[PDB]
Write an enzyme that holds these catalytic residues in place. Structure first.
Site, PDB file in Angstrom:
ATOM      1  N   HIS A 230      47.571  37.276  33.172  1.00  0.00           N
ATOM      2  CA  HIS A 230      46.668  37.931  33.881  1.00  0.00           C
ATOM      3  C   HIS A 230      46.505  36.660  35.357  1.00  0.00           C
ATOM      4  CE1 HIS A 230      42.450  39.377  35.191  1.00  0.00           C
ATOM      5  NE2 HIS A 230      43.729  40.817  35.020  1.00  0.00           N
ATOM      6  N   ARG A 273      47.765  42.417  36.717  1.00  0.00           N
ATOM      7  CA  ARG A 273      48.543  42.215  35.738  1.00  0.00           C
ATOM      8  C   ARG A 273      49.959  43.547  36.246  1.00  0.00           C
ATOM      9  NH1 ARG A 273      45.755  44.475  30.188  1.00  0.00           N
ATOM     10  NH2 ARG A 273      43.829  44.964  31.862  1.00  0.00           N
ATOM     11  N   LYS A 276      50.004  47.420  36.482  1.00  0.00           N
ATOM     12  CA  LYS A 276      48.005  48.314  36.891  1.00  0.00           C
ATOM     13  C   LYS A 276      48.061  47.994  38.238  1.00  0.00           C
ATOM     14  CE  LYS A 276      45.420  48.134  33.856  1.00  0.00           C
ATOM     15  NZ  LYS A 276      43.812  47.711  33.441  1.00  0.00           N
ATOM     16  N   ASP A 279      44.123  45.718  43.969  1.00  0.00           N
ATOM     17  CA  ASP A 279      42.717  45.481  43.471  1.00  0.00           C
ATOM     18  C   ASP A 279      42.481  44.187  44.605  1.00  0.00           C
ATOM     19  OD1 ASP A 279      39.664  44.442  42.975  1.00  0.00           O
ATOM     20  OD2 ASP A 279      40.089  45.261  40.969  1.00  0.00           O
ATOM     21  N   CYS A 281      40.261  42.021  44.689  1.00  0.00           N
ATOM     22  CA  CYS A 281      40.011  40.396  43.981  1.00  0.00           C
ATOM     23  C   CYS A 281      40.623  40.051  44.288  1.00  0.00           C
ATOM     24  CB  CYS A 281      38.789  40.695  43.236  1.00  0.00           C
ATOM     25  SG  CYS A 281      39.367  41.283  41.516  1.00  0.00           S
ATOM     26  N   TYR A 282      41.794  40.329  43.499  1.00  0.00           N
ATOM     27  CA  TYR A 282      43.080  39.134  42.847  1.00  0.00           C
ATOM     28  C   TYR A 282      44.187  39.466  44.444  1.00  0.00           C
ATOM     29  CZ  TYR A 282      42.005  41.787  38.348  1.00  0.00           C
ATOM     30  OH  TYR A 282      42.380  41.758  37.362  1.00  0.00           O
ATOM     31  N   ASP A 334      36.982  46.347  45.779  1.00  0.00           N
ATOM     32  CA  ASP A 334      38.643  46.386  45.080  1.00  0.00           C
ATOM     33  C   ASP A 334      39.441  47.691  45.826  1.00  0.00           C
ATOM     34  OD1 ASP A 334      39.745  48.287  43.202  1.00  0.00           O
ATOM     35  OD2 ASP A 334      38.523  48.402  41.558  1.00  0.00           O
ATOM     36  N   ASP A 341      30.484  45.253  46.761  1.00  0.00           N
ATOM     37  CA  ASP A 341      29.674  44.305  45.879  1.00  0.00           C
ATOM     38  C   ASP A 341      29.748  42.754  45.803  1.00  0.00           C
ATOM     39  OD1 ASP A 341      31.689  42.979  43.828  1.00  0.00           O
ATOM     40  OD2 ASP A 341      31.912  44.821  43.702  1.00  0.00           O
ATOM     41  N   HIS A 344      33.195  40.702  45.402  1.00  0.00           N
ATOM     42  CA  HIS A 344      34.682  41.991  45.560  1.00  0.00           C
ATOM     43  C   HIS A 344      34.197  40.978  47.284  1.00  0.00           C
ATOM     44  CE1 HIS A 344      35.841  44.336  42.449  1.00  0.00           C
ATOM     45  NE2 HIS A 344      36.931  43.420  43.179  1.00  0.00           N
TER      46      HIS A 344
HETATM   47  C1  LIG Z   1      30.982  47.209  35.648  1.00  0.00           C
HETATM   48  O1  LIG Z   1      30.075  46.439  36.515  1.00  0.00           O
HETATM   49  C2  LIG Z   1      30.664  45.896  36.472  1.00  0.00           C
HETATM   50  C3  LIG Z   1      29.511  44.460  36.844  1.00  0.00           C
HETATM   51  C4  LIG Z   1      30.466  42.539  36.017  1.00  0.00           C
HETATM   52  C5  LIG Z   1      31.436  43.086  35.696  1.00  0.00           C
HETATM   53  S1  LIG Z   1      31.481  40.828  35.155  1.00  0.00           S
HETATM   54  O2  LIG Z   1      30.543  39.776  34.397  1.00  0.00           O
HETATM   55  O3  LIG Z   1      32.176  40.630  34.238  1.00  0.00           O
HETATM   56  N1  LIG Z   1      33.149  39.890  36.060  1.00  0.00           N
HETATM   57  C6  LIG Z   1      32.309  39.968  37.846  1.00  0.00           C
HETATM   58  C7  LIG Z   1      32.243  41.227  38.217  1.00  0.00           C
HETATM   59  C8  LIG Z   1      31.396  41.379  39.472  1.00  0.00           C
HETATM   60  C9  LIG Z   1      30.866  42.460  40.235  1.00  0.00           C
HETATM   61  C10 LIG Z   1      29.846  42.294  41.056  1.00  0.00           C
HETATM   62  N2  LIG Z   1      29.304  42.005  41.848  1.00  0.00           N
HETATM   63  C11 LIG Z   1      31.623  43.228  40.204  1.00  0.00           C
HETATM   64  C12 LIG Z   1      32.684  43.610  38.958  1.00  0.00           C
HETATM   65  C13 LIG Z   1      33.000  42.671  38.681  1.00  0.00           C
HETATM   66  N3  LIG Z   1      34.010  42.403  37.660  1.00  0.00           N
HETATM   67  C14 LIG Z   1      34.902  44.374  37.291  1.00  0.00           C
HETATM   68  C15 LIG Z   1      35.293  44.449  37.667  1.00  0.00           C
HETATM   69  C16 LIG Z   1      36.600  43.220  39.367  1.00  0.00           C
HETATM   70  N4  LIG Z   1      36.722  44.429  39.850  1.00  0.00           N
HETATM   71  C17 LIG Z   1      37.340  44.851  39.001  1.00  0.00           C
HETATM   72  N5  LIG Z   1      36.154  45.520  38.162  1.00  0.00           N
HETATM   73  C18 LIG Z   1      36.269  46.795  37.330  1.00  0.00           C
HETATM   74  C19 LIG Z   1      34.660  41.223  37.695  1.00  0.00           C
HETATM   75  C20 LIG Z   1      34.278  40.468  36.354  1.00  0.00           C
HETATM   76  C21 LIG Z   1      35.275  39.410  36.740  1.00  0.00           C
HETATM   77  C22 LIG Z   1      35.190  38.420  35.865  1.00  0.00           C
HETATM   78  C23 LIG Z   1      33.760  36.948  36.768  1.00  0.00           C
HETATM   79  C24 LIG Z   1      33.046  35.892  35.415  1.00  0.00           C
HETATM   80  C25 LIG Z   1      33.553  35.722  34.694  1.00  0.00           C
HETATM   81  O4  LIG Z   1      33.073  34.846  33.977  1.00  0.00           O
HETATM   82  C26 LIG Z   1      31.920  35.303  33.527  1.00  0.00           C
HETATM   83  O5  LIG Z   1      31.796  34.526  32.935  1.00  0.00           O
HETATM   84  N6  LIG Z   1      31.343  35.786  33.808  1.00  0.00           N
HETATM   85  C27 LIG Z   1      30.394  37.085  32.771  1.00  0.00           C
HETATM   86  C28 LIG Z   1      28.780  35.721  33.357  1.00  0.00           C
HETATM   87  C29 LIG Z   1      28.559  35.304  34.353  1.00  0.00           C
HETATM   88  C30 LIG Z   1      26.830  34.538  33.930  1.00  0.00           C
HETATM   89  C31 LIG Z   1      26.908  34.215  32.514  1.00  0.00           C
HETATM   90  C32 LIG Z   1      27.694  34.506  31.669  1.00  0.00           C
HETATM   91  C33 LIG Z   1      28.473  35.217  31.930  1.00  0.00           C
HETATM   92  C34 LIG Z   1      34.490  36.854  34.287  1.00  0.00           C
HETATM   93  C35 LIG Z   1      35.143  37.819  34.654  1.00  0.00           C
HETATM   94  C36 LIG Z   1      32.281  43.323  35.005  1.00  0.00           C
HETATM   95  C37 LIG Z   1      31.887  45.205  35.430  1.00  0.00           C
HETATM   96  C1  LIG Z   2      35.326  32.013  34.826  1.00  0.00           C
HETATM   97  C2  LIG Z   2      36.117  32.110  36.406  1.00  0.00           C
HETATM   98  C3  LIG Z   2      37.005  31.370  37.041  1.00  0.00           C
HETATM   99  C4  LIG Z   2      36.991  33.823  36.273  1.00  0.00           C
HETATM  100  C5  LIG Z   2      37.949  34.101  36.645  1.00  0.00           C
HETATM  101  C6  LIG Z   2      38.649  34.795  35.636  1.00  0.00           C
HETATM  102  C7  LIG Z   2      38.651  36.998  35.866  1.00  0.00           C
HETATM  103  C8  LIG Z   2      39.476  37.214  37.230  1.00  0.00           C
HETATM  104  C9  LIG Z   2      39.215  36.926  34.385  1.00  0.00           C
HETATM  105  C10 LIG Z   2      39.076  38.409  34.377  1.00  0.00           C
HETATM  106  C11 LIG Z   2      39.820  39.049  32.642  1.00  0.00           C
HETATM  107  C12 LIG Z   2      39.856  40.166  32.154  1.00  0.00           C
HETATM  108  C13 LIG Z   2      38.963  40.356  31.481  1.00  0.00           C
HETATM  109  C14 LIG Z   2      40.156  41.336  32.752  1.00  0.00           C
HETATM  110  C15 LIG Z   2      40.597  42.105  32.507  1.00  0.00           C
HETATM  111  O1  LIG Z   2      41.265  43.518  33.308  1.00  0.00           O
HETATM  112  P1  LIG Z   2      40.479  45.050  33.790  1.00  0.00           P
HETATM  113  O2  LIG Z   2      40.976  45.773  32.659  1.00  0.00           O
HETATM  114  O3  LIG Z   2      38.852  44.776  33.969  1.00  0.00           O
HETATM  115  O4  LIG Z   2      41.199  45.699  35.172  1.00  0.00           O
HETATM  116  P2  LIG Z   2      42.944  44.728  35.268  1.00  0.00           P
HETATM  117  O5  LIG Z   2      44.128  46.088  35.752  1.00  0.00           O
HETATM  118  O6  LIG Z   2      42.540  44.761  37.231  1.00  0.00           O
HETATM  119  O7  LIG Z   2      43.431  43.742  34.955  1.00  0.00           O
HETATM  120 ZN   LIG Z   3      38.032  43.773  41.548  1.00  0.00          ZN
END
Ligand SMILES: COc1ccc(S(=O)(=O)N2Cc3cc(C#N)ccc3N(Cc3cncn3C)C[C@H]2Cc2ccc(OC(=O)NCc3ccccc3)cc2)cc1
Ligand SMILES: CC(C)=CCC/C(C)=C/CC/C(C)=C/COP(=O)(O)OP(=O)(O)O
Ligand SMILES: [Zn+2]
Lengths: 405, 315
Positions: A230, A273, A276, A279, A281-282, A334, A341, A344
Site C-alpha cells: 500500500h 494499490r 484499484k 486518487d 492524495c497518492y 481525490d 477537503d 487532499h
Molecule cells: C469518510 O470520510 C473520512 C474522513 C476521514 C478519514 S481518516 O482520518 O482515516 N484519513 C484522513 C482523511 C482526511 C480527510 C480530510 N479532510 C479526507 C479523507 C481521509 N481519508 C479517507 C480518504 C482519503 N482518500 C480517499 N479516502 C476515502 C484518508 C485517511 C488517511 C489517513 C490519514 C492519517 C492517518 O493517521 C491517523 O491515525 N489518522 C487518524 C487519526 C488522526 C489523529 C488522531 C488519531 C487518529 C491514517 C489514515 C477517513 C474517511
Molecule cells: C500516519 C501517516 C503518515 C499515514 C499515512 C498513510 C496512509 C495514506 C494510510 C492509509 C492506510 C489505509 C487504511 C488504506 C486503505 O485504503 P482504502 O481502501 O481507503 O482505498 P485505496 O483503494 O486508495 O487503498
Molecule cells: Zn485520497
C-alpha cells in the site's frame, strides 16, 4: 499541429483499459473512472476552447485561510484529529508561499499546547489522550511555524518517555497506549525523534528490521507483515528507513518497480494499490517515494540515475492534478465528482511540488506544466514540510542534548 | 436505550438522571484555530463525556454515553479506551459487546478503531469462532477492505485456522480475478503452510497463474504473483519460462508480458549466461518499445533499466 498536453494527444486514447472481454467489479469500476477522466480531458475540444492549466492559488488560499480558524460540522469526524488539520492547512499555505501571520502562529502554538499531554506526546484535541499520529502532525506544524515560541512548546524529555512507552520487544511501535501496531507508527516516531534530537542508541533497535518484514512479494510495504502492499504504508516504511539510515534493509529494486507501476497509464495519477482506482492524495505518498529512492540508490553508486527527472511521468501527474483534482470553489480532491477537503488539498499540492522540483546534488531541474505562476515551494520528501523548516528545526534542536545524554 | 436517531432523543442537558453532573465545555482557549462548529447534539454528548472522563466515573450511565460519543465520532480513540475501561470495571457481558461491534463495523467498515476494538474482544474471550464468517460478510460488501484482510490475517495466524483459507481464496479469485487483496491472501496462506519450494506446489501455482493470464492477459495481479513466486530463486533457473512467454505474444501481448521478458533477460545476464550479447540486445530493444511506444508513462523507469543493463553488461 501538435499537443503540448500529454493526456490530450491522440495516441493517448490507446492507454484506455483493455478488459480482454472479461468483466469484474474491478474492471467495471476502473472503466467508470476512465470515462469521467476522459470527459474532463476531452472538454477542451468539446467546448472549442484552447487548453491552459492554472493552479487556482487565490481560491485555494481563501479556503485555507478560513479553515485554519473555523470548520463546518462536516469535520465532526476529525474532532480527534485537530493537529492534523493544523498541519494539512499550514503545509498547504507554506507550499503556496503564504506567510503565517504572527498572531495566527501564536494561536496555533497555544492550541497545540492544550493538546500536549503531561506524560508526553499530543492528542487529537485538548484533553484527549496522546497518540503518535497527532504527535507527528503537531511537531510538523510547529516546525512549519518554526519560531522560538513554537519550538519551545514541545517537551522533549516527556516526548522520549512517551515513545519508549510505545516501543515493542520486536522493534515495532504502538500508535498509542493500549492501541495497535503498524509501519505508520514507526515513521511517526522516527520523524518526531529525529527533528527534535531525542534519538538514543537503543530507541530504534529492531525497528528497521521490523519495517523490512513488511515488504512483501509485490515489492511494496504493507501495514504489518503479510499484508497487501500500500502506497501510504510504503511511504512511511521507506521514509522511516531513510531517517534511520537503513535504506539498505529493503529490496530497493523491487520497491522501485512497484511504485513506478502504480502510475496509471490513462489518468496520470497514482493508485494506492494494484488494481484499484486513481486518487489525488497518492500524488504524494507514491510519487514522494521516487525522490527517496533516488537518494538511496545514489548513495550506493547507481550511475544510471537521471540528473534531471525523478523516475515517474512528472508531466502527467501535474496534468492529472491540475485538470481533475481542483475544486473551482477552492481546495483539492481525490478525483472528479468527489468533494474537497483539507487532506487532499495538502497532499495534492505536496505531490504537485514533487512533480515540479528535481534535486540530486548540485543538479536542480524544474518542470512547471501550465502557466509559470503554478510553481510551488519545494517540500522535503521525508517530512513533507519545507526543506528550510527541516534545517532550521534540526539545527536548533542539535543545540540541545539528547535527554539522558 | 435511547437512540441518537430516535424522534424522542433528548439532549443530556435535559435528562433528569444527569442533573447531578455539570458538563465540561471544550477548553479551546481565548483564540481557537481549526475550531469545529459542532452540532448541538454532538457538543452536548461530548460536554457530558468530558465530565464523566474527568471524574473517571465508572458507571452504567457513562457506558451508554460512550456509545453515543462513538456513534457521533467513531474515530475518537479516547472514547474507545474509556469504553474498554468500563467494559472491565462494570464486568459487562463481552458477548453482548461482540454483538455491538459487529453492528458498528457493518456500518463503518473503514475505521481502524472498531476493528482494533474487536481484536481486543477476541483476545479477552479467546474465541475466534465467529471471525472467519463475520469477516467474509464484510468482504462480501467490499472485497478489498484493508482492515478486514488484516483482521483475517491476524485471526488465521493467532489461532492457526489455515485449513480452509485457500478454498476461500479460490472462491473470491473466481468472483474477481483482478482482486489484488485475494492474490495477496493466496500468498499468505501458501507461504505459511506448504511454502513455495515443494516443487509440486510451485508448479501448480505457476500453471494456475499462467492459466489466469491466458483468460485475462491485461490483468496485472497474476503477472505480479507469477513474478513474485519465481523471482525468489532467480528467473533464469527456469529456462522453459522464456519461451513459454514468447509463445503467448502473438495472441496475448501486453506491456506486462514484455516487462517480464526484460526481467528474465536481466537474470540471465546476471548469471553469466551463454551469449552475453544477443540477450542484452533483446533486452534493450524491449525497454525501448516500452519507453517509446507500449508503456510510456513509465518512460523514466525504462530509460533507467536500459541504462542499468548497458552499464552492467557490455564492457
Ligand atoms: C469518510 O470520510 C473520512 C474522513 C476521514 C478519514 S481518516 O482520518 O482515516 N484519513 C484522513 C482523511 C482526511 C480527510 C480530510 N479532510 C479526507 C479523507 C481521509 N481519508 C479517507 C480518504 C482519503 N482518500 C480517499 N479516502 C476515502 C484518508 C485517511 C488517511 C489517513 C490519514 C492519517 C492517518 O493517521 C491517523 O491515525 N489518522 C487518524 C487519526 C488522526 C489523529 C488522531 C488519531 C487518529 C491514517 C489514515 C477517513 C474517511
Ligand atoms: C500516519 C501517516 C503518515 C499515514 C499515512 C498513510 C496512509 C495514506 C494510510 C492509509 C492506510 C489505509 C487504511 C488504506 C486503505 O485504503 P482504502 O481502501 O481507503 O482505498 P485505496 O483503494 O486508495 O487503498
Ligand atoms: Zn485520497
Amino acid at each position: 499541429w501538435s499537443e503540448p498536453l500529454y493526456s490530450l494527444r491522440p495516441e493517448h486514447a490507446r492507454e484506455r483499459l483493455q478488459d480482454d472481454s472479461v468483466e469484474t467489479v474491478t474492471s467495471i469500476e476502473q472503466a467508470k473512472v476512465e470515462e469521467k477522466i476522459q470527459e474532463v480531458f476531452s472538454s477542451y475540444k468539446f467546448n472549442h476552447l484552447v487548453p491552459r492549466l492554472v493552479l487556482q492559488r487565490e481560491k485555494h488560499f481563501h479556503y485555507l485561510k478560513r479553515g485554519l480558524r473555523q470548520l463546518t460540522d462536516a469535520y465532526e469526524c476529525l474532532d480527534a484529529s485537530r493537529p492534523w488539520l493544523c498541519y494539512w492547512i499550514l503545509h498547504s499555505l507554506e507550499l503556496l508561499d503564504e506567510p503565517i501571520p504572527q498572531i495566527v502562529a501564536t494561536d496555533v502554538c497555544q492550541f497545540l499546547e492544550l493538546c500536549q499531554s503531561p506524560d508526553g506526546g499530543f492528542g487529537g484535541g485538548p484533553g484527549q489522550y496522546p497518540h503518535l499520529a497527532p504527535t507527528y502532525a503537531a511537531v510538523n506544524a510547529l516546525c512549519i511555524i518554526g519560531t522560538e515560541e513554537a519550538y519551545n512548546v514541545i517537551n522533549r524529555e516527556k516526548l522520549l518517555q512517551y515513545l519508549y512507552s510505545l516501543k515493542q520487544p520486536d522493534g515495532s511501535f504502538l500508535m498509542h497506549v493500549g492501541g495497535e501496531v503498524d509501519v505508520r507508527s514507526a515513521y511517526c516516531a522516527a520523524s518526531v525523534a529525529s527533528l527534535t534530537n531525542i534519538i538514543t542508541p537503543d530507541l530504534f533497535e529492531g525497528t528497521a528490521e521490523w519495517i523490512a518484514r513488511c515488504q512483501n512479494w509485490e515489492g511494496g510495504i504493507g501495514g504489518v507483515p503479510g499484508m497487501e502492499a500500500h502506497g501510504g504504508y510504503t511511504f512511511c516504511g521507506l521514509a522511516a528507513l531513510v531517517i534511520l539510515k537503513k535504506e539498505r534493509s529493503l529490496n530497493l529494486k523491487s520497491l522501485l518497480q512497484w511504485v513506478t507501476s502504480r502510475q496509471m497509464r490513462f489518468e496520470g495519477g497514482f493508485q494506492g494499490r494494484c488494481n484499484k482506482l486513481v486518487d489525488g492524495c497518492y500524488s504524494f505518498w507514491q510519487a514522494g517515494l521516487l525522490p527517496l529512492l533516488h537518494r538511496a540508490l545514489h548513495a550506493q553508486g547507481d550511475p544510471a540515475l537521471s540528473m534531471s527527472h525523478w523516475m515517474f511521468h512528472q508531466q502527467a501527474l501535474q496534468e492529472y492534478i491540475l485538470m481533475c483534482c481542483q475544486c473551482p470553489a477552492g481546495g483539492l480532491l481525490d478525483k472528479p465528482g468527489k468533494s474537497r477537503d483539507f487532506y487532499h488539498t495538502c497532499y495534492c499540492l505536496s505531490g504537485l511540488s514533487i512533480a515540479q522540483h528535481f534535486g540530486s546534488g548540485a543538479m536542480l531541474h524544474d518542470v512547471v506544466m501550465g502557466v509559470p505562476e503554478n510553481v510551488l515551494q519545494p517540500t522535503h520528501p521525508v517530512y513533507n514540510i519545507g526543506p528550510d523548516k527541516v534545517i532550521q528545526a534540526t539545527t536548533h534542536f542539535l543545540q540541545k542534548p539528547v535527554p539522558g545524554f | 436505550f435511547l437512540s441518537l436517531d430516535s424522534p424522542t432523543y433528548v439532549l443530556y442537558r435535559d435528562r433528569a438522571e444527569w442533573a447531578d453532573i455539570d458538563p465540561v465545555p471544550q477548553n479551546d482557549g481565548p483564540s481557537p484555530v481549526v475550531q469545529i462548529i459542532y452540532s448541538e447534539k454532538f457538543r452536548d454528548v461530548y460536554d457530558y463525556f468530558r465530565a464523566v472522563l474527568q471524574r473517571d466515573e465508572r458507571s452504567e450511565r457513562a457506558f451508554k454515553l460512550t456509545r453515543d460519543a462513538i456513534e457521533l465520532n467513531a474515530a475518537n480513540y479516547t472514547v474507545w479506551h474509556f469504553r474498554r475501561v468500563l467494559l472491565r470495571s462494570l464486568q459487562k457481558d463481552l458477548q453482548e459487546e461482540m454483538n455491538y461491534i459487529i453492528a458498528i463495523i457493518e456500518e463503518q467498515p473503514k475505521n481502524y478503531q472498531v476493528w482494533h476494538h474487536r481484536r481486543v474482544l477476541v483476545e479477552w474471550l479467546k474465541d475466534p469462532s465467529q471471525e472467519l464468517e463475520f469477516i467474509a460478510d464484510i468482504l462480501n460488501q467490499d472485497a478489498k477492505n484493508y482492515h478486514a484482510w488484516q483482521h483475517r490475517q491476524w485471526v488465521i495466524q493467532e489461532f492457526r485456522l489455515w485449513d480452509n483459507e485457500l478454498q476461500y481464496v479460490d472462491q473470491l479469485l473466481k468472483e474477481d480475478v483482478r482482486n489484488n487483496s485475494v492474490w495477496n491472501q493466496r500468498h499468505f496462506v501458501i507461504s505459511n503452510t506448504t511454502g513455495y519450494s515443494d516443487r509440486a506446489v510451485l508448479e501448480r501455482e505457476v500453471q494456475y497463474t499462467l492459466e489466469m493470464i491466458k483468460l485475462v492477459p491485461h490483468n496485472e495481479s497474476a503477472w505480479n504473483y507469477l513474478k513474485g513466486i519465481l523471482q525468489d530463486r532467480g528467473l533464469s533457473r527456469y529456462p522453459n519460462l522464456l519461451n513459454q512467454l514468447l509463445d503467448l505474444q502473438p495472441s496475448h501481448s501486453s506491456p506486462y508480458l514484455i516487462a517480464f521478458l526484460v526481467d528474465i533477460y536481466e537474470d540471465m545476464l546476471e548469471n553469466q549466461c551463454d551469449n552475453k550479447e544477443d540477450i542484452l540486445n533483446k533486452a534493450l530493444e524491449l525497454c525501448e518499445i516500452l519507453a517509446k511506444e507500449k508503456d510510456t508513462i513509465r518512460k523514466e523507469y525504462w530509460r533507467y533499466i536500459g541504462r542499468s543493463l548497458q552499464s552492467k553488461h557490455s564492457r
